[PDB]
């Protein structure tokens, strides 16, 4: 567990970093999904 890999992180630190990246991606995606529905409603795209 305590092994420090060539990035300088441990396994647990690397998972902690990625979990925040996953969370941020979900926030971005949720906003983007709303923006696409707005774009579909308000622009000529999709009619």
């Amino acid at each position: 567990l305590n092994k420090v890999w060539p990035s300088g992180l441990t396994v647990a630190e690397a998972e902690e970093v990625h979990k925040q990246l996953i969370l941020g991606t979900r926030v971005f995606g949720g906003m983007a999904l709303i923006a696409h529905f707005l774009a579909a409603a308000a622009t000529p795209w999709l009619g």
């Binding site: 890999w5 060539p6 990035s7 300088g8 992180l9 396994v11 630190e13 690397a14 998972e15 970093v17 990625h18 979990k19 990246l21 996953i22 971005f28 622009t43 000529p44």
Partner: protein
Amino acid sequence: MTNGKIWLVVKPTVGVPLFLSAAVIASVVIHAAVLTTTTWLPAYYQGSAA
């Protein structure tokens, strides 16, 4: 979700700026593509001037 070990072999100070920069560039590319290929988006900027 399963790829978290990427940060054992990629430095986050490299990969996280690259990841976010790529997202930002991608968004600009998409907006620029829509602007350059539709009439309706430049008409939106033009507003009541046309």
